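Exercise 7. Given the components listed, write out the predicted structure of the assembled complex. Treat all entries as one system.
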Amino acid sequence: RAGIVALDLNPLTGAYEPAYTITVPSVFDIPESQRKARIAPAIQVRFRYAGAVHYSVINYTMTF
Amino acid sequence: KLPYSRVTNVTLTRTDNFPTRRGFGTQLILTHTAVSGQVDATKRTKLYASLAEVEADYPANTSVYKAALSAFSQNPRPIRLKVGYAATPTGGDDAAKKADFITSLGAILNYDQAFYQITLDAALRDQPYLDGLVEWVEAQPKIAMIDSNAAGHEDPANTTVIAARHKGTVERTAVFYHTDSTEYLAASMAAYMSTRVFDDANSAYTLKFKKAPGVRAIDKGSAVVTAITGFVEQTGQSESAGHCANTLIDIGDQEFLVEGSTLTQNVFLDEIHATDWIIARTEEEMLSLFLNNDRVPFTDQGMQQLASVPRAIMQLAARAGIVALDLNPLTGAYEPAYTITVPSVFDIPESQRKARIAPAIQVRFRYAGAVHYSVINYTMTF
Amino acid sequence: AYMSTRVFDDANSAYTLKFKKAPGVRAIDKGSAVVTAITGFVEQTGQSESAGHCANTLIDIGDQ
Amino acid sequence: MAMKAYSMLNVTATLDGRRVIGLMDGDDAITTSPGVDVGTMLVGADGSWLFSQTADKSATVVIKLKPNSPTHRQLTEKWMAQRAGRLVGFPFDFIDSASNEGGTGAEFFIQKAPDDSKGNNAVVREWTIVTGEWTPTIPTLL
Amino acid sequence: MAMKAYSMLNVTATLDGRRVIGLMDGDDAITTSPGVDVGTMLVGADGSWLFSQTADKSATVVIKLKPNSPTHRQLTEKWMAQRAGRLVGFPFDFIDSASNEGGTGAEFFIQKAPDDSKGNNAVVREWTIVTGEWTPTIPTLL
Amino acid sequence: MAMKAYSMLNVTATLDGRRVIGLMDGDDAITTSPGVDVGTMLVGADGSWLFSQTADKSATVVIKLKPNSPTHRQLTEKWMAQRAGRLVGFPFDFIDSASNEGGTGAEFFIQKAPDDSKGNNAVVREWTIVTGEWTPTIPTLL
Amino acid sequence: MAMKAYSMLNVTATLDGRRVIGLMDGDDAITTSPGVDVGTMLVGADGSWLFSQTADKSATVVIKLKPNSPTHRQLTEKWMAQRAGRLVGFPFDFIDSASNEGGTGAEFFIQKAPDDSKGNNAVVREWTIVTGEWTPTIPTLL
Amino acid sequence: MAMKAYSMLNVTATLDGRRVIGLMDGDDAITTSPGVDVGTMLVGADGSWLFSQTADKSATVVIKLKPNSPTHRQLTEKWMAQRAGRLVGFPFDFIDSASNEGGTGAEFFIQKAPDDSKGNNAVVREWTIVTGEWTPTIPTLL
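Answer.
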């Protein structure tokens, strides 16, 4: 909403592409050998940055 | 201090710029000239982006620059002309023999298939070996056009000229007859033809019959404009009483193309252009169907999935105005404009099923033409 | 002082540049071809690493 | 060419090139309805009459899906593409091979989005799409 | 990664950081619905058409609870905080682990309060909350 | 020569040689109205009377269009040509083939320009044109 | 270059260099109307006629905003600058990317100020601005 | 400093030092409107233009009250003081804490008095006050 993450469109072609994804791991196959750690497994998140403009160009052809 | 060019860049040139207006197709310019830096046996064809960026071909050579000059000179402009290397040898080692020219034609497809309209320009004009192009573009999804600079098509009797020795037998070639020193095929084709978008409603330019090029000159005469273009006043167009071509007459203070680029007695350019758009669009949609799906199975469900493509293309085409409006042209009674029939894989044997080649789908048409000539009677009674 | 008082909890609060911003009171440096050795900024290409050294100098172009 | 009895095994629906697969239970899983009435009769105070026919050929279709179907994922991606600001056509087409009854539309749009209900048993997800031009196909096998 | 059949044992809903626990019986215990239609087709007197898409991405969710549930106490405290004049966001989020279907909203508000019926048997308590921005999550497991 | 019922598919309107295409929805998409009353009755203090007929044969027509129609582009170019200082006629003509009712005018001018409203749904663009001479055609098919 | 259906996500309005953001609900959120009629037909007692075209190319635009929008703050600062005695232009511009319809004006002025109503629900804030020169842009995409 | 949603619990109005309490129902309970238009555009016969800005900064506010409110008693005492011949200022001020939007005026006067209707249900009592100088406050929280 602030404008930091991009607007859900492929910057190359303009086709639809998700801006961010969030994938949650399973504790299920993490062994009880590691479960007793009280340290949760890692959650992975995905990004896409939305930049801005520093420099502009205008051409102005004249025909008379 | 510092210039404003530190944060922006504002320039100014003295040239003419028109909007882009992308369209359908591309044309081909075949000659014998080679530029040695961009066609030298490495590119039987070469693409471009704009005319100004031309450096490889000299801005004075009659073949390429003087033809791209009229190719790129429409009010909206096409893009990316397909520049030449094709028949660099002069027609044939034995000049009168057309076999070398036919083989040259058959060896320029093998590099590139992106051109649709074939134009020879500023040379190769009125050569007897050119018969290979006319015989060859038949059964070849392209359009062949030959603009003479001078000939004897103005005699409604002679049989030696291009448009006489091939008249009424070819349905995919046309002649742009004119006087000397003007490149004409490029003037309208691929410059007005190219920027025709059939994806909009009512975008059927069925005529191509009264259209103004960028800048050019007219020919002269009244009874000589019917030996050429073979057009009789109110009857229509007669094959025996003239030779079909296009001459850019002027009637009022306006100059415009005439005869609408016929090919044979009553076959016009927009019919070919529009049907070829239909074919090329069905190709694109079929390919886009093979890339989205995991697979297309070899069952009846797969046949219906495949046949879903012509059904959408026909609805797209009837909206543009190419397909007719669902009424019998003879009596005005109801009649379907188009039908689509899907075959069965069921009784096609498994002996043939293992081919991975689907059976053929058949589609039906009806063309919607337009008007070239009007009549008004005006009875007076006092 | 400007970076600190940036609240990203509002809509459209992305100051992606920080590229044309006026401090309270200060003074400019001098030059035109010396402002590209510093800040390593070429005109329209972008910013090149070999042709300069990145930094910030508070130029003045118009009366700003 | 025997007239096949009806069966959902012989109906095929294609949305943006892909098949429609996980449909809910019932006699109304894909239904298309015309946008307006075909015409209107106008009768005057004297007994004379006049008919008027519309030029509007538009329709909606309603698709009922299960909460576990790939078409639900496809439609929810199309919805987000529309919400981003990308607005294109996406054809829809369906037909019955037993009678050749159906229709096509070259440009559809999402009109209504379903409700996500969790509850104790699984329930329907209903999508609605709309076109400005719908042409029915003629059933040539009656 | 086998596709799990549906079960309310594998749906999780988080309201202001805490879980939602005592839900009523039925197939509609948490339901989210979009605020408006996605778009509108406009057909003219000549047969031409124009589609228009909205920029409003808002939703409500309805939560049905039993008269003995800690979430009822949490929601009745939030209601009194709003009535006092303190107006903040309180995120709500819920998802299904079998298909990754759900959605999130970072700022919700109480919209409707339930009715306290005593009677002979115990009955539902229905709350309604509203957000100005709701983004559905893509079901990547179909 | 059966009397065709009414239909907008059989009405044709020609503005400066080109057809009028994208019209708004409603029963009043092209309406022409005469400039003044045809005549006036004058009754004196004694009961005698006198009728008087005007020589003014002028009319306006109002055209309601969608925001996406080529006729809107044509009319906005004509408006700018008039604003530049170039003042010519541009005929307008429309007729119904079912009854031969309509009229023609060989020289029209732009009189009112529409309002550009953006909003949430698309809305009308109304143009007004005026002539000094309008001749109705006689409906010979009743 | 497909003709995009209408959407407020693809309309951009620029006031004094900044975007216009918090708009009210409805089909009329930014509307521009020409100042006068384009021309006038004058018909004489004999049936002859004369048209006259104006040289006035001016317009107003009305902007409807919510009580919580940065454009309301910008416009209320511009109003106070005008009340102090500082009178300058402040360009306004808006366009639609789907059809290239819109217009520009290099010097605008505040003409009407809104009413501050508090009440029980939030309500509109309507501003009006006026220019002496408004040039519409030609919709080249129809 | 989160932007609080709108609420009448966070709007405060002060009349002659005391609070305004018993307000009627509706979205328009305190409304302030400027006395005149901010300016006027003057376009000549040649197309040139001239803007003119006013120096009048005055406003009225309308307050709608219930028949049982202490502010009604305060205003009816002020009315009788004015009718006696005692003419002084009595400031009025109101603001919204969520956005800092409002305004102040150091000298107001009674302009209209309400109608005393008895009837079957209770009805509104509307007062109007006027000032010669009203300065809006800048909403610094947008």
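Discussion: The two ends of chain H are 12 Å apart (CA to CA). Chain H touches chain G through 40 residues (CB under 8 Å).
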